[PDB]
Amino acid sequence: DSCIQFTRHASDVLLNLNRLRSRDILTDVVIVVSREQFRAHKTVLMACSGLFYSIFTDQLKCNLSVINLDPEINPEGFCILLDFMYTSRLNLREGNIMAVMATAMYLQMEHVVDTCRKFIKASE
Amino acid sequence: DSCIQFTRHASDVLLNLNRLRSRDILTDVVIVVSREQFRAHKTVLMACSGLFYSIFTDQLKCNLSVINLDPEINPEGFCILLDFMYTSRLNLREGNIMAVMATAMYLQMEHVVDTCRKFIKASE
């Protein structure tokens, strides 16, 4: 086509989706990770994670307001990945890398798994 | 903070939100523009338009499944802007610029209004 493109559009959309999340506006699911609960937008979760894409395209699970993750999942690791989904920013640290990598593998977030593998290999 | 950032993340999220829209997955509103209907995600509309942000943060309108736009709004102009919301790509042409600009003013999409004004000024 003969379209023009606004370079910052995708980043501005994501910034606004994060603002809606922070204000709990039109959030439609709560992700339960052991004792912790995280409110989010199903569409953002699906757009970022192979696992959520699978869950919310399921004819029964698409209608659930609560999703319980595997008990082995670390809440902090999930929190870091949820923030990454809404911001493109990953708070990767020596103290959380193993938890973040395990959570990204479970959530099927290949690019996160890739940088965790690379950061781990550099430290050995 | 000491975060790392994935450059293509925002663009990949938007591409997936557009894929969900094309497959009518978790769309939660229909925008009626005279004889035409457009299915969308309320969160994407709010993230792109001052008008939809106002509408869906309203305590009564947030729960509506159908929104009727002003009869003066051109369906093609709306279609072009809806595509832009989900892709960052604006199909701006000599034959549609007036309709696109009027629709962007109504929808409160300042960056679109700006490029329409600039393209019009260059042709006079």
């Binding site: 023009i4 493109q5 606004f6 | 604006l90 960056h111 490029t115």
Partner: peptide, 4 residues
Amino acid sequence: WVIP
């Protein structure tokens, strides 16, 4: 705005 750019030509993509």
